RNA sequence: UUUGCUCCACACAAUAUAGAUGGAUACGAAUAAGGCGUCCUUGUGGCGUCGCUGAACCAUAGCAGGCUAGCAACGGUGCACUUGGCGGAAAGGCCUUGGGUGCUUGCUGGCGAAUUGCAAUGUCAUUUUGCGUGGGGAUAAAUCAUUUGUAUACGACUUAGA
RNA sequence: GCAGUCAAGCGUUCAUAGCGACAUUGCUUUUUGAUUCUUCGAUGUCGGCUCUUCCUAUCAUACCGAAGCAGAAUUCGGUAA
RNA sequence: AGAACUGGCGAUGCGGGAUGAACCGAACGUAGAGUUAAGGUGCCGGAAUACACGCUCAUCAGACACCACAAAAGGUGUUAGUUCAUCUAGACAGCCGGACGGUGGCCAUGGAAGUCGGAAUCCGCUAAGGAGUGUGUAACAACUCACCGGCCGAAUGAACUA
RNA sequence: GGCCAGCAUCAGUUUUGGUGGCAGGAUAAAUCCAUAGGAAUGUAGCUUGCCUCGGUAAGUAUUAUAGCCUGUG
């Protein structure tokens, strides 16, 4: 009967999310993140066991040098 | 035939003052205030007057003459929602299944909750718009007050309600239930 | 075109046992004076078996105005046969002159009874000599009293194609 | 008329509209009544029930009272001096204030006056007045008269009269087994109430007639004095 | 003349063409919505398929035809060792 | 939403000139079945009527006056 | 303190006295007084000092000017150019900034080569002092 | 005159501008028209939405991918109006559309370039009052086109800017102003009048 | 790689025009409304003024713009530097600090110009590549063949090999 | 369908010279759901297997409106491919 | 469909109608210049996004032929008209009031009082008010209109045509 | 003497401007002037009510402290 698209059945879905579904997802993404933290830590801690620049300017000022030579360009003419 | 000048006239009351600069109307009085944007509609207003205003529209059609009333009715609406203010009463009636509307914070706004409508587990939520305070009457049982400065948002918030709880599949001779607005009137009576 | 008006008096071509016949007149709007003439004889014909061929054209001349820098309220009478059959009709124009006002008329006619000047039939124009007997509001709103209205939204005629400033529409 | 207009709604009922020539058969008779007649005073009876009318209209024979419109009875009479009918006439339609009525007459003026002093009859607190009394609508099922006659004397409104009471009169009312019912006693208007339109409307719908009638006569023309005596029994 | 007998198409048309993947490693091209107010997480990972075995779930479906009762399930087995991060790339956000 | 097939407006040659036999067949049964007024109208809204209609019924005489001697 | 404010357009009125400006036609550039309002878009104007017949004329030739004398309905072209003395019409109209600019344009198109080089040499000795105007406060 | 023309796309009819641009590019003039979103069409929004979806029914129904390509983006439906208006099948037409730039927002180097307007595509110079309107990005966000909010974006971005330069071009201008005004009574200047400069 | 490759200072060959020849000269918004200036009580405020087109504004004089002498100001402007800041939509541009050297038609002088023979675009940009001209910086990969089988009709794909 | 009828209108000059929408009446197998359980020359070869798409004049599913629609079900209608 | 005539095509290009046996234009050697026809002048496309008077907004306008069909009508779209009617003895729209008396007329029946029905359908009193226009009641009650009247103040209604 | 051109004075065809002199008509109608009447989309004045402070409402009055229409010349 109802659709997938049904504007019904997802607005039940909807009303649902913000419970008990938005409650675990959020809490296992703090576990997670928890985790995560441990885990750099953890590397932390046996590490103590031990223009942009002239390449890009060169470089863009020839492709620009480039298309007005050739009249490719898509912003100049 | 083009009328060559066809007028209406918005009489403002004493406590009342109205800013109008490119058709946006601003309506300040003693109950708030209210705006409205007027941009839609080529019309022409005119202060002649500290108590009266002249809106006009010039070499005008039939159907352009139809909106200086429009206008106008708007801007008095404005004046008596900020001076009488508006009071929309709605009663909610049942047969065997006792409507529970209460107010709740969801997430920061401010909503009526319909509960148990014909015994339907589905919370009916309807927001409340902003402007409008929706207070319960104790010395009637099951009514509902709506006030406001705007007409528009009190009667569109009205029937808001007055929409949710509406009997789907059930003979309407038979099955009465629902919210209904019971009367229109202004919070103030006399004034 | 742009009309004239023209007196036209013709009569039938005399006879031995009619000298000097009927001298009839008929005042009648044209482009030009042939245009006029041919009219002059389809009204004669009409109005009575007058036939172009038993008859002249004793004069033909052209009527002016005599105040033509003074507006008027004209009250023009017409027939016509157009779409479907035959109609009286009865149109204010507030104007400056006979010829004015009787091209304005063809114009209106033209624009919403889509008929053409060979279906157009002029009874009688008249100025109205007193306010208060014209009859249509849209001339009559025009008669008021310190009558004043703006032109709203100007639209200014540009002779470039490309303009450097927003245009406006003020005054 | 161009389109777009509000469709008259026509409908098939036997009475029609009366038209110029009633106006003008009143204009006649109320020159005849004052060719006629003596004494003509003017009666405003402004809100006047027919049978009130009825009886006081026949509570004489040799009397004619006359109604209509009462611009044609102004112009009967005559506005001013330059279009009056009789001498010192234009002093009464000067005198025509609302619904009148002409009382021409023979009887003496002491026998009319007084009985336009002494005539009166009951009728509904019409709107706009100072009201007669304060009724309130006991809670409970309402009965026809409102509690005027007790519960067991008085039958219960009609059901059909629920509507009407809850969206013209604005009672709150309730329909608990086809009887019309108000949880908690309503009160209608107080004494000294100027009333509204919709507590006048309450007040006739349950038969409420505690305010009185009669008839506010003013000024009188005497035909052959030739004037007019500005009594005022308001 | 129309078709005697309906009948629905035989595969899916949105899965077209149905050319060889441009790469071995199938592209993401849509990530989780951000939502900013949640700490920094990474919304995927690289591991390798590894295989298939088989899995008894002591299943808690309540409302079910099997619930309180253990079913028999196939699973996939991706070997995941850990991922190193080696870079940044910013991404703009323009009309095109 | 689905917005459905639009009609062309681009007529045929074929379709226009078979309209105009058809205008033709039309116009020529029309005569075959032809070969098988109430109003001097002074208009009611002219303002000077009551001056046209005294002047030409004063131009009554005419037609009666002068045809006999 | 509080009272209503409604911005009014101050719209130029066709009147009986309003002064126009006939852009084109054998009148361009000439004022001329509209004497009586024939219709929505056509009226009857008189510019007898600059030289304009009476005549009826459409509103959009003419153009609407900010001036505006006293001139009852109908006024025959001699009631029009004493009334149009009287006011000072012209006067009004040759100190608004719009004929100055008309006349400017005027001037312009005049100027033989001479004097476009007089130009060219005088806006470069008011460029020299007003840059030296500049940079100093 | 100028080498390029920046049109400002704002409040301009599609048709007509897209018509005087095509009659520009194939006289040899080279036309770039930036704020593709906010132009303009006749008639109400519906009925716009309803003729773009007549042109979507199109589609060479044996293989979609070589039936008529339906852009959504304000820029290319501008350029679909104007592709329509030359002969682009041609070499002359080819060339001709290649003297044309259309952009949504106004992206560099043309938001530090004049923008000028065309009075007879102008939608207030041309459009009767009270005619319903309807504005090309309302369109193209409703039929598909997806970057509607990316352009609302940069657009407030680069009017914060240009309101920023307009504030110091308007403080400059009130210098010179003054400095003008004050030399307006010279003996240079009262020559400069008598040739009306 | 007779040092191939790249980035910096000159001399010319080849030059190239979907069409240079004073300047694409930057608010936003409204259009039955606005721009600008000013004031305060900073507003949908007051006052003034403007449009009615860019027919504007800026530039614009010199052998296609030479060589020189001064006056007056300390302005404008060019070039190569340099200071700081801003610009990511396609930023590749905008603004700013300082000195250096020119120019200055803001004003007044001195000399040259011819013969291109009465016109013939009468060539005045950069557009780049390059044989070279003398100073810098840089020191890989891909394919075939072999191999793999997460792929495969063949190409292709995915692996591995100093 | 035929034959009538009425007449909104039309013609018009005469509304009876004539046309003429809608509406309606006679004809069709017996008024008490029995029969009428009841067949009567297609000068025609198109039709199925697989498979795709389109139409909407919608059978279903979605949402609506009107009904003695209590509920359940149904009927009629709307948007809808 | 038959007859009689006259034109067009056959044998015939060219301009126009986007296209083309039947349409509009057009005296076919090779060219030059001018002017035109029919058709046109937003762009495709040579040529006015000319001037001017109106009308039209179409949720798939029209650009088109028309004593052509679907076509006779339907529409609280808009415009111009015609005829008739009402109107300072107060028009249209609104509220407010009266809306009566014989009488609950006769018959019917469980009831039927203007309003389930069948037939009468009159009189009085009137400014006006049906032996009742509809909602209503078991019947009544009440409300309502049609009809008058009070307030307001000046134009309005109806049928038709384009 | 070959190729390509510029200017001038002409001839033929043609296109587009500037300007002059006449003729006609209601011997243009008009505008303008003079005059005799007249009215309202009534000017001054006058009366009166209302007052927000000299304005305001309707009467009166035919040029007056504005004008207009018509006829004739």
New binding site residues.
Partial sequence: ???LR???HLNAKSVKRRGVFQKAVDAREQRISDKLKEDLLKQKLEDLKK??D?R???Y???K???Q??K?TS???? | ??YI?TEQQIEVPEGVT?????????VVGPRGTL??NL???????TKVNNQLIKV?????????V?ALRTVKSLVDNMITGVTKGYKYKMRYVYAHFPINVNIVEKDGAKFIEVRNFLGDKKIRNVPVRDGVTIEFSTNVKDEIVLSGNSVEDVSQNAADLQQIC?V????????LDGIYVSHKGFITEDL | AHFKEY?VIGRRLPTESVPEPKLFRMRIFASNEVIAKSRYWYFLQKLHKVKKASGEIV???????????????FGV?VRYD???????????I?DVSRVAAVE?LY??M??????RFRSIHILKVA?I????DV?????KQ??????KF?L???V?????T?????????? | ????????????????????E????????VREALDTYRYVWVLH??????????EI??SW?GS?????????????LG?KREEEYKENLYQLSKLC??????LFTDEDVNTVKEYFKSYVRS??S???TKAPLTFTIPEGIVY?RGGQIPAEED?P?????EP?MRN?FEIPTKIKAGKITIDSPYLVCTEGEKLD??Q??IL??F?IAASEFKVKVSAYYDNDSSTVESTNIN | ???????????H?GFLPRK??????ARVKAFPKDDRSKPVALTSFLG??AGMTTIVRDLDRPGSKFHKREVVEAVTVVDTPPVVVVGVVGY????? | ????????????????????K??????KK??K??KK???P??????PYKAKILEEIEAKKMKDLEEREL | ?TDS????????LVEVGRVV?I?KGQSAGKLAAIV??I????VLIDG?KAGV??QAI????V????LTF??????????????WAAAAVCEKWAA???????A???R??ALTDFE??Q???????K??????????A | ??????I?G??H?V??????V??QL?????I?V??AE?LNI???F??NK??Y??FL?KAT?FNKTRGPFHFRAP?RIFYKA?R?????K???????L??L?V????????????????????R???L??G??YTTLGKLSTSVGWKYED??AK??????V???????????F??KV?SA?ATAAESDVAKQLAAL??
Avoid: C
């Avoid at chain 1, 898509?74 to 003419?77: E, I, N, S």
């Avoid at chain 3, 200014?156 to 470039?160: H, N």
């Avoid at chain 4, 409104?157 to 009269?161: A, D, V």
């Avoid at chain 7, 130009?119 to 000795?125: A, G, I, N």
């Fill in positions: 009967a109802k659709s049904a504007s019904s223009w942009r002239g890009h300017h060169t863009k000022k020839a620009l040098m480039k007005s030579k009249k898509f912003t100049r003419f | 035939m083009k000048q109205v800013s109008i600069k490119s058709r946006i109307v601003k705006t409205k941009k839609h509609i080529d019309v022409t207003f006009a529209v010039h070499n005008g059609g039939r159907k352009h139809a509406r789907r599949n059930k003979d309407i001779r038979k099955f | 007196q004069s033909i001349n052209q009527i002016n105005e005599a105040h033509p820098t003074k507006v008027k309220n009478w157009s779409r479907s059959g035959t109609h009286n009709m009865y149109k204010e507030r304005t114009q209106d033209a624009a919403r009874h889509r008929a100025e000599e007193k306010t208060a009859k249509r509001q849209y001339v025009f008669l008021t009293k310190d009558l703006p709203p939204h100007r200014q005629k540009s002779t470039k490309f303009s450097y400033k927003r245009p406006s529409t003020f005054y | 008329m161009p389109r777009s207009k509000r469709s008259k709604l026509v409908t098939l009922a036997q009475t029609d509209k009366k038209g110029r009633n106006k003008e058969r009143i204009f006649d008779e009876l402004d809100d006047v029930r027919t049978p009130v009318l009825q209209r026949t024979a004619k009272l006359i109604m209509g419109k009462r611009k044609v009875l102004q112009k009967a506005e204030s609302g619904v009148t009525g002409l009728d509904y019409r709107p706009n026809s039958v409104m009609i059901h059909s009269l009407t013209k339109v919709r006048a409307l006739k719908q038969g | 003349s129309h078709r005697k007998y309906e009948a629905p198409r035989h595969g048309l060889r993947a441009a790469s071995i490693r390798y398929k703009v956000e323009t009309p095109r | 939403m689905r917005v459905r097939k639009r009609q062309s407006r681009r007529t045929s040659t074929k379709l226009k000139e078979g309209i105009k058809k205008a033709s067949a039309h116009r029309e005569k079945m032809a007024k109430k109003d109208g002074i208009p009611s809204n002219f | 303190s404010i409604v911005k009014a357009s101050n719209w130029r400006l852009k009586e309002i219709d929505q878009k056509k007898p017949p009476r459409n509103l959009g030739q153009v609407l000017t900010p006293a001139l009852p309905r109908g006024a025959r072209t001699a009631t029009v150019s004493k009334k608004s900034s719009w004929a100055k600019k008309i400017q344009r005027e312009r198109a476009r080089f130009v060219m040499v005088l806006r470069k000795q460029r020299y002092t007003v840059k030296k105007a500049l940079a100093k | 005159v100028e080498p390029v023309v920046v400002d704002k409040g009819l048709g007509r501008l897209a018509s005087v095509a009659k194939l006289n040899g003039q080279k770039v930036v704020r906010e006749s008639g109400e519906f009925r309803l003729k979806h007549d029914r129904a820029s104007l329509g208006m030359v002969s682009h041609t070499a002359r037409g080819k060339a001709a290649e003297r730039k952009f949504e927002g106004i992206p560099p180097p043309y938001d530090k370039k004049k923008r000028v307007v065309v009075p007879q595509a102008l207030v110079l041309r009767k009052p005619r319903k990316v352009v940069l657009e407030a971005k680069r009017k800017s240009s309101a920023e330069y307009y504030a110091k071009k308007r403080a201008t009130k102003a003008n009306g400069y």
